[PDB]
Structure 1
Amino acid sequence: ARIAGINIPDHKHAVIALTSIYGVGKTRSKAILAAAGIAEDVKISELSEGQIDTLRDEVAKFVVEGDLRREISMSIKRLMDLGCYRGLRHRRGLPVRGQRTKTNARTRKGPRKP
């Protein structure tokens, strides 16, 4: 019960507990586990270390917690250093995809100042 650095979800089901890794949702976890041949509705307390070892090398191809946290930072380091439009929205805490900023803009700002 130790996958890709922490991964300690006890008595959760198989495809559900694997999504605790930063780097996998429910689609990849049912794709990762089908590549190793384990039934997807079984709790990981049932799984033995002779079955957990097939999970460790399968999750090593899709990038996870260690480097996935920094590859998405490599892009935002690149855009803020170049000075594009999305870089300055990243540089000022504003929305990037062209959403409304007159009224809401609020999950990007955070709280409200006054």
Structure 2
Amino acid sequence: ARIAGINIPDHKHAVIALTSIYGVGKTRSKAILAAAGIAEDVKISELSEGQIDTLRDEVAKFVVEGDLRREISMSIKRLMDLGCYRGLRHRRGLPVRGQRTKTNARTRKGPRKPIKK
């Protein structure tokens, strides 16, 4: 049901449903289910409330949701405040991990502009 302040879907199998939590992906979701001892092919709807309480503890074992989002934001702020290359590139919305800017780079730049004219 509700874990880490979000509602994991009922129809979805447990592994996929836990992936909905930010900070949780197939690898963490698969582990949580192995540590709690619940089969992955069980729907959240089939799961009893007591098992859900156990899952919530396993999710707390990992930073997720707001505490993670904050960490990511603070790290990006760190790079921009430092004045490093990766910080200036975050400032200009230009690709930070090397990459080419002559062409492509439209995920970072977003949709094209009409040549500013």
* TM-score, normalised relative to structure 2: 0.95
Gaps of 5+ in 2: none
Instruction: Map 1:66-77 onto structure 2 (within 5 A).
Output: 66-77=66-77
Gaps of 5+ in 1: none
Residue by residue over 1:55-112, the C-alpha shift from the partner in whole angstroms, topping out at 9 and shown as x without a partner, is: 0111101100021001011111001011000000001000011001101111100011
> Superposition RMSD on alpha carbons, in Å?
0.7
| TM superposition outliers: structure 1 runs of 4+ over 4 Å | none
Aligned length: 114
User: 1:50 and 1:37 mapped to 2: Cα distance?
Assistant: 13
* TM-score, normalised relative to structure 1: 0.97
User: 2:106 and 2:24 mapped to 1: Cα distance?
Assistant: 27
How far the C-alpha of 1:8 sits from its partner, in A, is 3.3
**Percent of residue pairs bearing the same amino acid type:** 100
How far the C-alpha of 1:6 sits from its partner, in A, is 1.1
User: 1:92 and 1:101 mapped to 2: Cα distance?
Assistant: 12
How far the C-alpha of 1:7 sits from its partner, in A, is 2.2
